Symmetry: C3
Subunit: 193 residues, 3 copies
Amino acid sequence: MRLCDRDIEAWLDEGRLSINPRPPVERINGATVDVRLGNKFRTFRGHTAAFIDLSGPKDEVSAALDRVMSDEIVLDEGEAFYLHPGELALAVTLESVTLPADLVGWLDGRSSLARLGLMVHVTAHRIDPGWSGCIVLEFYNSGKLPLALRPGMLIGALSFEPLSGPAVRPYNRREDAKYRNQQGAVASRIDKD
Amino acid sequence: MRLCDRDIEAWLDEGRLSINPRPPVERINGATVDVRLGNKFRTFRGHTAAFIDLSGPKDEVSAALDRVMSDEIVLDEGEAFYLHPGELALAVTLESVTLPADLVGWLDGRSSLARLGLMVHVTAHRIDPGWSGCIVLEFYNSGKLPLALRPGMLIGALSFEPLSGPAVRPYNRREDAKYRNQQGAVASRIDKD
Amino acid sequence: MRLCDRDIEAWLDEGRLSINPRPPVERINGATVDVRLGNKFRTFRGHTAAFIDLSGPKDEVSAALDRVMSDEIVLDEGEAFYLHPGELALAVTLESVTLPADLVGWLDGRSSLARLGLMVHVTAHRIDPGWSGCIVLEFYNSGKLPLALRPGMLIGALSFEPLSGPAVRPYNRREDAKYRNQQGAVASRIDKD
Ligand SMILES: O=c1ccn([C@H]2C[C@H](O)[C@@H](COP(=O)(O)OP(=O)(O)OP(=O)(O)O)O2)c(=O)[nH]1
Ligand SMILES: O=c1ccn([C@H]2C[C@H](O)[C@@H](COP(=O)(O)OP(=O)(O)OP(=O)(O)O)O2)c(=O)[nH]1
Ligand SMILES: O=c1ccn([C@H]2C[C@H](O)[C@@H](COP(=O)(O)OP(=O)(O)OP(=O)(O)O)O2)c(=O)[nH]1
Ligand SMILES: [Mg+2]
Ligand SMILES: [Mg+2]
Ligand SMILES: [Mg+2]
């Protein structure tokens, strides 16, 4: 059961669900709230490494991720991020989202974006109960034309689903959770497994 | 919570949602209804433009969009659409779908298709409350062989999820809604933001 | 709704839902169960065929399917599968999963993976009521680095949604279902349509 727009407004009103800054009524409809693009981005630099060993020694994985991730890219005013066909980039939503333990959220892209080849995630769009933070985005342009992305644009949408009950281990209270306190285009923390 | 098959036929019989034409009992099972491929397609014309500035001057973007998008392709019966690896294309389902204000629909591809690298949407699969119209698809071949696509083939599935209540701003009533009355392989209307 | 972590535990304890080997409490949290990578893979031998005609003479298709799919790749103790950028491969979960008739399953990748461009499915992540088998994965590396994938790594997560009622045609009973008894990296059976 997804929350319809009126119920999202009420959960936002009771305050155990928070989205900061809260999108206006124009941006809450049907069963979704729209989200916008922030100004933090990351690209990859392959020429430093042959591969990343997802399960190799923790220490060596940490080194690798550091050699292939650029530092965080912040665009100056009026500047766009040019997302080219075939070139994965990280970003973040403008909004920070905080979910109570009895709710899960799901991120969609936008049909208007899909129709130009823009994926907003890479088969990982689940915002967990306990989640608090901005939501990281994995952009892939599967299209034929580069796309200029500007901070501020409508980039995705969130739907919300009350759970059968309060999660007994929500994200915020879980010791090996990787991304609590998320805020920019944070790179993979696969080396934490 | 999704409608089981029996309830889907029950909502169909009582007119609480429509699928036109209505798939036979063979294509309604578990918690889904299969949909079939339409015969309208669109490709992209990269050479005519450098890039698309998703949230730039409306006239610019609008014009760019009209430059890079093919006219609508209608297959002469028997004809195939050859979807090559690397080549995004727009299409549409055979079926028209109409959803009430208290239900959201979700498009799936097919495992049989996935195992050949065919994506049927680019992170945009939500069919909104109040929606009425044929569903546009975004085909991307991530695999290693060209795939011949013909009208009338089984291309995906829809599952339906009642909302916590009736949406106050459902799609058919939102005035900045982009794709109401969509009945073909309609291009992105991202300029309309 | 989806089952909160407790309730997942309830259904495993009750027993109509089953996951073998049952993941420890630690890999069950929020609204999901974590699933792990199996040791069976398949690749594509493109040079043996010009294309696959998704809805051509059954004959034609199976042979072409047979010609393009590799012999299963079985990784033995301490081995890696190198998934290079742009090279679709088939794989499977470690876990076998059985869903009762009144439950639907949904596969997600992992954010940690997503941020290095690994998709774990190609728009086909629904696990059907009546399903009993290992879950096949469709890996696509959309990033810029090769990724070493080792059997037993955390590769994804499942969440569960109870249905409005028991499906009248669940997977295990549906005569034309293609993938029951799935115990490895099973190729597309689009020719059985
Ligand atoms: O796979 C899909 C998904 C969506 N749509 C339709 C159904 C949905 O109700 C609508 C709007 O979807 P979305 O909000 O993702 O697209 P948008 O680009 O944001 O358009 P709008 O500004 O109208 O929200 O487009 C399709 O035709 N095919
Ligand atoms: O990530 C997934 C998703 C699905 N499947 C399995 C589960 C599901 O119940 C079954 C059928 O899926 P679907 O209906 O999408 O595929 P199909 O190609 O239409 O096969 P069928 O004719 O069996 O419906 O395949 C997997 O192995 N992995
Ligand atoms: O599109 C998304 C999806 C998820 N996340 C966040 C929300 C979520 O609750 C968290 C963890 O997601 P997941 O469990 O898929 O990733 P992980 O790689 O397994 O990390 P962890 O070890 O923390 O579970 O990351 C995002 O920032 N953007
Ligand atoms: Mg929208
Ligand atoms: Mg199916
Ligand atoms: Mg996780």
